[PDB]
Amino acid sequence: MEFLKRSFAPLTEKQWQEIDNRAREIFKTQLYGRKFVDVEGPYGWEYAAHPLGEVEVLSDENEVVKWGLRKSLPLIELRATFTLDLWELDNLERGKPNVDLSSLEETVRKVAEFEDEVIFRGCEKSGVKGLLSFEERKIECGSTPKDLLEAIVRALSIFSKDGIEGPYTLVINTDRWINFLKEEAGHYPLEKRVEECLRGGKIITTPRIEDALVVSERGGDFKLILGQDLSIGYEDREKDAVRLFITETFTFQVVNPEALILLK
Amino acid sequence: MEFLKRSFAPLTEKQWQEIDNRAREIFKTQLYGRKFVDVEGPYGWEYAAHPLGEVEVLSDENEVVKWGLRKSLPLIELRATFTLDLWELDNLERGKPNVDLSSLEETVRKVAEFEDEVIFRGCEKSGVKGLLSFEERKIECGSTPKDLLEAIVRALSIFSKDGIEGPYTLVINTDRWINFLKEEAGHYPLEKRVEECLRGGKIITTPRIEDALVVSERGGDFKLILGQDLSIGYEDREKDAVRLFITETFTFQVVNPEALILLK
Amino acid sequence: MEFLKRSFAPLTEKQWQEIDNRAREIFKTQLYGRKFVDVEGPYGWEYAAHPLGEVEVLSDENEVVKWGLRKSLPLIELRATFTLDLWELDNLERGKPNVDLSSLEETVRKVAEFEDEVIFRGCEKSGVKGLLSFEERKIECGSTPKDLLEAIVRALSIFSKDGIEGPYTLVINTDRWINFLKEEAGHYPLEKRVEECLRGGKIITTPRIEDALVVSERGGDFKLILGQDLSIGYEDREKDAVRLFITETFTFQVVNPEALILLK
Ligand SMILES: Cc1cc2nc3c(=O)[nH]c(=O)nc-3n(C[C@H](O)[C@H](O)[C@H](O)COP(=O)(O)O)c2cc1C
Ligand SMILES: Cc1cc2nc3c(=O)[nH]c(=O)nc-3n(C[C@H](O)[C@H](O)[C@H](O)COP(=O)(O)O)c2cc1C
Ligand SMILES: Cc1cc2nc3c(=O)[nH]c(=O)nc-3n(C[C@H](O)[C@H](O)[C@H](O)COP(=O)(O)O)c2cc1C
C-alpha cells in the first residue's frame, strides 16, 4: 500500500517487478511454515492484536464491579533492510537478464527463517507458542524405515482417537529423510510407502526442525494471522545504492494442538 | 446480542424493558464521562485491543531481521451482577407502576462511577491514561468568581495558542460550583457569565473530580473506544431472584492533550 | 503549486493532509492580523511588487524629457524550515491518532508571529508601515472600565467625524483585557457593554500588541496583499527526517489611516 514508499525510490517499474519476482520466488520456495498452516487474510497495516476471546479478571472478590482486561495476541512487525547497487539495476534497464540481487536473496532467506522460527519454535516476548512447544503431543520413533512407518500409523490412530480426520502430512528434516532413504536399499519407494501409510498424504522436507512432525491439513487448526503480508518497500538512497526493506506484520496461533503429533 | 443470555431469564418482555428503561435513565443521567468525550462506535463483543499505531522494537542492533511488537490498548471488560426479586417483577406484571429496582439502581451507579473513574483518573493495569493525569496542562485558579472567569479566559488563550478551536465546556465539581455561586451575591448570573466567557460554551457539574477542568468539544480529541456498550444480561436464578449483570467492554484514549486544561 | 516540491517528499497523501490540517488549525487560530484586515487575493508565486500608484521624479527641472520611477511595495517572501521525524509519520500510517508534530507547531507559531509583527509593527527594510506606526491616530485611556467605554465612544465619535461608518472592533491585549475584567466585579458583562458601545461590534483579544486598538470592518481600508498564501513544501530529507518549509509571499498596506484609532 502507500506506506511502502515504493514510488519514491529511484527504480523503474521493471526494476521493482524484477525485485518482486525474485523475492516472491525465494519466499515461495523457502516458506516451509506456510505449506501446512492456515493463513488468515491480511487485516491491513493497522492491525495490532488478534483477539484470544478471553478475559483476565484483575478485580478483587469483594468488589461490586468486577472487571478484567481482554486477552489478545500482539502482532510481530519485522523490517529487514538491504541495499541494492543502483548501477546493477540500471544495467537491468540496459537489457541484462542476470542482475545481481545477492543481498535481496540473503535478506529474503533471513526473513523466511525468522518467520519459520516463529511458526515452529515460537516467541516468548510476543506470547506465541510454536509447533515444537507442544511436548504432550509427542511419540517416540526409530532410525529404521519400519519404525517411521509404524510411528506414522500410530500417529494416524492417535488422530482418529482425537477426532482429527483430514489429509495428513509428514514434516520431516531433510537430513533425517536422506538417512531414512539410505536404509531403504532397493526394496520400494520409501516416499510412496510413507504417503500410502499417511492415507494419501504428502511429505514436506524442511531444514527448520531436527526431528519429524505430523499435522493434518483439514484446516482451521493452525492459523497464521497476517496484518500485512510479506512486502518490499523503500527507505532511503545511500548515494550509490537504495536501502529497501522487507516488512511483515503477523502472529501465529495453534488453535487445536490435537492436530499435531511430534515424532522423536 | 445473543451472548447476553436474556432469553433464558424468567422475565417477560415488559419486565426486561422496564429494567432496561431504568438502567438507561440512570446511566444517561450519571455518565458524566460521555458528556464531552467522543464515543467510538461499538466494534462488537469480540473486540480485544485498540491499535495505538506504534511498534516496540525488541531486537538487537546487530540483528539482520529487526522486529518488534505492535502497541495496542487492551479493552477493559466489566461485569457487575445484581439480584432482582422475582416476586416484585411479577407484581410489575400485575400492574404495579413503582417496582422496586434498588439493587439495579445501585449497580448502575457503581458501573457509571467505575467508567468515570477510568475516564478521568485512568487505570494503570490496562495502560489507559485519564484526563486528570495530564499535569502539564494545568493552570492555577482562585476561590473568587473573578478568578474563575480569568482562569477561563486564560484557558481560552492557551487553546488559541495551541490551535484548538471549538466549543468549550467547563467540567467543574458540584460543591466547588455551589461555592462559586455563593460568592456571587446578586450581581449577575454566574453561569451566564461563565458561558459567555467560554465563547458560548456550557457548564458540566460533576461529582467525579475535585477541581475544575476545561475541554473542547470540536471532536476527535477524547476517544471512548467501545467494544460492547453498556448492556444487561442474565446469569442464573437464585430460587427467589434472578442474578442479572451489567457488562461493557471499553477503553479510553486521550489523543490530543492540547484539548485539555486543568484548573487548580 | 508545483514549485512546492511536495510530490518528491517521502510522505503519503494522508501524512501530507495531516500536516496541512495541523498547520491550518494553528494558523487559523493564531493569525490575529487576518481577523480584521482585508486580504487581497493571491496573485501567484511570481508576484514581486504591489503598485503604489505614485511616480518619484528623478529628473532635473531644466530637462526637456522629465521622467521618474514608479513607486511600488516589494513583497516579503519568508521561508521557515522544520524537520519532522519520518518514523512518527510512518506510525501515522500505522494508525496512530496523536502524531508528534511539535516542530511543525513551533514553526507555524513563529511564522504567524512574524506575519503579525509585519502587520502591526511593520518592516522598515520592505517599506511597509504597520498599524502601530500611526501615532497621529492615538487617544488616551485609563485602567478603569468606565475609561475604556468612554475611550470607545470617543473613538466612535472620531470615526463619525472622519466619515468612517462600519462595524467596529476592539483589538485589545489579552492581559489588559484580563485586568479590565478584574475591575468589573459583578456589575454586568464587560464584554457585552463594550460590544454595545461598539455599536454591535466584537472584541479581538491578541497577545500581539501592548495597548488597545480600534478599527472599522467596513472593508477596503487595511489590505494584506498576498502573492502566495501560507503554504507548506518539501526541501530535502536528512536521512532520518524530512526538512519541510512554510512559505508565504506578502506585503501590507494601510490605505486609510482614518479607519484606525490607537488607545493609550
Ligand atoms: C470480567 C468478568 C467476566 C466474566 N465472564 C463471565 C462469563 O463469560 N460467563 C459466566 O458465566 N460468568 C462470568 N463472570 C462471572 C463468574 O465467572 C460467574 O459467572 C458468576 O458470576 C460468579 O459466581 P460465584 O459467586 O459463584 O463465583 C465474569 C465475571 C467477571 C468479573
Ligand atoms: C520493527 C521496525 C519498524 C521500523 N519502522 C520504521 C518506520 O516506520 N519508518 C522508518 O523510517 N524506519 C523504520 N525502521 C527502521 C529505522 O527506524 C530507520 O528507518 C532506519 O532503517 C534505521 O537506520 P539507522 O541505521 O541510521 O538507524 C523500523 C525498524 C524496525 C526494526
Ligand atoms: C514623471 C512625471 C510625472 C508627471 N505626472 C503628472 C500628473 O500625473 N499630473 C499632472 O498634472 N502633471 C504631471 N507632471 C507634470 C507636472 O506635475 C505638472 O502637471 C506640470 O506639467 C508642471 O508645470 P510647472 O512647470 O508649472 O511645474 C508630471 C511630470 C513628470 C516629470
Residue numbers in the entry:
A (entry chain A), B (entry chain A), C (entry chain A): 4 to 267
Publication passage describing the model:
Bacterial nanocompartments, also known as encapsulins, are an emerging class of protein-based ‘organelles’ found in bacteria and archaea. One example of the redox role within encapsulins is found in the hyperthermophilic bacterium Thermotoga maritima, where the cargo is a ferritin-like protein (FLP). FLPs function like ferritin to sequester soluble iron, Fe(II), from the intracellular environment by oxidation and mineralization in an Fe(III) form.
To better characterize the flavin–encapsulin interaction, we determined the cryo-EM structure of the purified encapsulin complex at 3.3 Å resolution. The high-resolution cryo-EM structure of the shell revealed that an FMN molecule interacts intimately with a tryptophan, W90, between two shell subunits. However, upon close examination, there is additional density near W90 that corresponds to a flavin undergoing π–stacking with the tryptophan. However, denaturation of the encapsulin sample in 7 M guanidinium chloride resulted in a canonical free flavin fluorescence profile. However, no yellow coloration was observed in the W90E sample during purification, and biochemical experiments revealed no flavin characteristics present for the W90E mutant encapsulin.
